[PDB]
């Protein structure tokens, strides 16, 4: 059953870690515990595929460009996660998509941009920057609450059919 590795990157506080325990545990983590790297496998069915998913969930600011480079070399595809009440962590996502391709010597990689916290009132995200930046880049825009639950399967589903995708034309 294909095993998909999959890395939620972004700044600290976006929620990268409540939207991996909501999909892998099914509930909302109040708390902020700041990670340091923690992993989970997760068995799910995707468009009639068993697929089982390796998520690395990663470090908002890391005390290692070793361990970045680390993760953005095994990531078969990237979960681009900002929070739509912080600028900079949108600001952040370019950077990181950046070292991405740098890392693995390609313009093509998989990944979804997620803007997270999406319940908040607090916005300062634009939803036209958030969708223009993705079409710029040529992945899909979510937009997610952790605490709702909203698009959070389908964040992580919608990266697999990306990675999916990239494994056809690689080979077209
Ligand atoms: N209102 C709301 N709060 C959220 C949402 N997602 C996460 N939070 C809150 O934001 C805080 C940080 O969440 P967390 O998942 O730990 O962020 P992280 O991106 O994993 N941080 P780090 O990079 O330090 O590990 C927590 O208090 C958490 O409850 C969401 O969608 N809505
Ligand atoms: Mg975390
Ligand atoms: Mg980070």
Same mark, same amino acid.
């Given at each position: ?20 325990? /909501?999909? @892998? /545990? *099914? ?8 990670? @340091? ?5 997760? /068995? ?21 460009? =070793? ?11 990237? !979960?681009?996660?900002?929070? @739509? *009440? *912080? ?9 990181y998509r950046e &070292?991405? %391709?740098?890392? $693995?010597?390609? #313009? ?7 803007? *997270? %916290? ?12 958030? &969708?223009? !930046? ?8 979510? #937009? ?8 959070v399967d389908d =964040?992580?589903?919608? !990266?697999?059919?990306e990675i999916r995708?990239? $494994? ?5």
């Amino acid at each position: 059953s294909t095993e998909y590795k999959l890395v939620v990157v972004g700044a600290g506080g976006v929620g990268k870690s409540a939207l991996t325990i /909501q999909l @892998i /545990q *099914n509930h909302f983590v109040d708390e902020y515990d700041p990670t @340091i790297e923690d992993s989970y496998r997760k /068995q799910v069915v995707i468009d009639g595929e068993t697929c089982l998913l390796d998520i690395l969930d990663t470090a908002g600011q890391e005390e290692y460009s =070793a361990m970045r480079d680390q993760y953005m070399r095994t990531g078969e595809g990237f !979960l681009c996660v900002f929070a @739509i *009440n *912080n600028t900079k962590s949108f600001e952040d996502i370019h950077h990181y998509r950046e &070292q991405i %391709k740098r890392v $693995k010597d390609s #313009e093509d990689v998989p990944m979804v941009l997620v803007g *997270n %916290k999406c319940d908040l009132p607090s916005r300062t995200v634009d939803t036209k920057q958030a &969708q223009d !930046l993705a079409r710029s880049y040529g992945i899909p825009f979510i #937009e997610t609450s952790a605490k709702t639950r909203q698009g959070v399967d389908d =964040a992580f589903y919608t !990266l697999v059919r990306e990675i999916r995708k990239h $494994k056809e034309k690689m080979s077209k």
